[model samples]
Target: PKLTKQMNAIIDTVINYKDSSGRQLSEVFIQLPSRKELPEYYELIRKPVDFKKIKERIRNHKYRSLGDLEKDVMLLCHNAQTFNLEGSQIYEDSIVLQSVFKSARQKIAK
Candidate 1:
């Protein structure tokens, strides 16, 4: 059988998962495709996550990484601040993006 780039790429992407919303997804279960053909599984399940919220949290330093956010949410459930939308309005977006941008700038500055 002839190998293809898409086949290799699919395997390479095991370390990363992208959601239907075009955002990084977490906690995926992957196995070697049981068969070479498509529809290898009868069903698949994925839960939707609010990437905007996660991105906002990461940018704001309330959460350092998506893993950080997931940990908080798992421990505290929906009530967790990791998934909270409140107080975001009270805080300026610049407060979040600025620090991160500065850190990146410093690296480039060096």
Candidate 2:
């Protein structure tokens, strides 16, 4: 599957997001897609996350590169691919594109 420019945009937004002091030490949390908004056919099972703790860790820790953060976002795309709305057929990539937008919207809203 091809990566959309939006993915790059998201990664850029998070990697560049900083605090009032212009320090990259601040944490940026992106929300995982909600099951309720997903198609019934997809029926994805999402794992619960402790976002507050996650944000705390992110704020405290420093990364050597944005590559690690990029990997995390790409993992979200992979996780979305696991639910084939097309049911083991073609056009799953297209479905992925739709899911990407849907998921992004949900993430930003949180």
Candidate 3:
């Protein structure tokens, strides 16, 4: 199936970024293609995502267990020079992070 413009744009932009985390981003993006676009025939989509697991991890993330999305959130928070709250939950404590995690939870549930 042809990739949508959204898919193309996300892949290109992140791939071009080539930052420390960009390679991880690329891997995660490729993983999603086989499951993207619901209501389309299920030629390749895999089992639906496990969001409860993902949210639990995000809610308790430190630096080590983070994947592309969690790592990106950590990096962005660091880059923006936000006050680092040591020993606190990364996603749940920040409104933007919480919202992003929430949206991801909704998408996977759909």
Candidate 4:
């Protein structure tokens, strides 16, 4: 049996990832941040994005191409970068997972 269609593999590289502290990237990225929990989120980021949002576009065939997904990833990862102070939880996690995305892009290049 086969799984993971198209962007599924690439997006999973970040979404399915976890850490030594048992933190799942999905917990952070799979859904929109709660406005009540994070009062500064909408204010801090003029526009917010998420893995599920990307997945919806891909599944709906609305995402233009791999480049489109890459651009969206770039936008939000840096949103975390700019929002999270350096050396913090989300800051470090975003850095490594984005690096993982680059590797996934490479293997699928051909």
Candidate 5:
């Protein structure tokens, strides 16, 4: 992706920032599910995203700004890993995880 100055700074922050438990927020992107594995709910949204195209755009298409790339990343992975967490249990902790993401975005803006 074509990272802007702000996006590069955000990426640096994500790479360097650690949670209270010493977990790096940037780890979420590692070993992401292939396009085929994304859930049906991903397609339910009114935006009608062609995720395959989005993935391709990020990895293979013309250079994309990091801001644009982050948008796709959030859509693809944000609280969407249900198989990793027990169903309702995942939902239960959504607030905490969501806060982490919110903080990440805030940090980027700063």
Candidate 6:
């Protein structure tokens, strides 16, 4: 199999990561919270990072390095944890995904 680029490789690993309950973080964090349905989410989160948005940014070459992408990945998790109640499923998933992102990036060792 051909080797994937560092950014896509990390994104794939993180988006496919499942928690103990077998829930993939991608499905939950796929898109940004809607302004109508979750108007306050933007106010609270402020960072405004999601899997879809990150992917879009990557495609546009907004990130110059894997570390740049990692920063957004971490922010995505950070926003989730910030908005969700402490000890809730999504909050826990934030921590889990945080570790997953970090672990995946470390393997690249750039």
Candidate number with greatest lDDT: 6
Q: Higher TM-score: candidate 1 or 3? A: 3
Candidate 2: clashing pairs of residues: none
Tens-digit per-residue lDDT, 1-110, candidate 2? 11233344444444444435664421312444355655552355353322233243345553233344344444444554554444643234324433444455357433
Shift in Å, residue 31, candidate 3: 25
Supply the global lDDT for candidate 1: 0.33
lDDT of each: 0.33, 0.41, 0.35, 0.76, 0.49, 0.81
Q: Give me the runs in candidate 1 sitting further than 4 Å from their true place.
A: 1-49, 64-67, 72-110
Q: Compared with the true structure, what per-residue lDDT tens digits does model 3 show for residues 1-110? A: 12232233332343333334333222232222233453332342223222233333334542232234445544443422233245444322343433444354345324
- Worst lDDT run of 10 residues, candidate 1, spans 1-10
What are the C-alpha RMSDs, in order, of all predicted structures? 17.4, 13.3, 16.7, 3.1, 6.0, 2.7
| Per-residue lDDT value at 31 in model 3 | 24
Worst ten-residue run, lDDT, model 5? 44-53
RMSD of 1: 17.4
| TM-score attained by model 1 | 0.22
> What is the number of backbone collisions in each predicted candidate, taken in the order shown?
0, 0, 0, 0, 0, 0
User: What alpha-carbon RMSD in Å does predicted model 2 have with respect to the real structure?
Assistant: 13.3
Q: Pick the candidate with the highest TM-score.
A: 6
All candidates: TM-score: 0.22, 0.31, 0.22, 0.82, 0.43, 0.87
List where candidate 3 sits over 4 angstroms from the true fold: 1-66, 81-94
TM-score (C-alpha, index-matched) for candidate 4: 0.82
Ranking by lDDT: 6, 4, 5, 2, 3, 1
Model 4 alpha-carbon miss at residue 50, Å: 1.1
State, as a TM-score between 0 and 1, how close model 3 is to the true structure. Answer: 0.22
Candidate 5 lDDT, tens digit per residue, 19-47? Answer: 67776654444344545776554454333
